[PDB]
């Protein structure tokens, strides 16, 4: 029943859709990789924080980290060009990501594409 090669990689999505999707599920520390919109062969790393924007009744704040792609590698903010998103993401899944302000984005739930129905 739909058994094959699954993963977190989505394909096409906009920072506007992610925030809606990620939140829709309601899973903290949920990251999802999507293709850029106005960037050259680039991607965007969207992660759902376990912290609400307001309080009890508001959606979880998301973090869009511009993902740079150098030919066949990936990086964010720094030069560290991972062999692939699988490594760049995994490394963060254990270590995590640090935002300028200080926020620590953790990736434990590999947001899967999901059967787009409806």
């Amino acid at each position: 029943g739909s058994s094959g090669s699954s993963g977190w990689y989505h394909g096409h999505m906009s920072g506007g859709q992610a925030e809606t999707l990620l939140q829709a599920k309601g899973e903290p520390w949920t990251f999802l990789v999507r293709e850029s919109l106005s960037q050259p062969g680039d991607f965007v790393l969207s992660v759902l924080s376990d912290q609400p924007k307001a309080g009890p009744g508001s959606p979880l704040r998301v973090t869009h980290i511009k993902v740079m792609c150098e030919g066949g590698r990936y990086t964010v903010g720094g030069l560290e060009t991972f062999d692939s998103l699988t490594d760049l993401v995994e490394h963060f899944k254990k270590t995590g990501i640090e935002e300028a302000s200080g926020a620590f984005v953790y990736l434990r739930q590999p947001y899967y594409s999901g059967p787009s129905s409806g």
Binding site: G15, G16, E19, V44, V62, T63, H64, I65, K66, V76, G77, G78, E80, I97, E98, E99, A100, S101, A103, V105
Partner: peptide
Amino acid sequence: ATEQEITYAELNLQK
């Protein structure tokens, strides 16, 4: 107008 241009986080590194 009233567009939705989400902002990205400016991670911090050696830089």
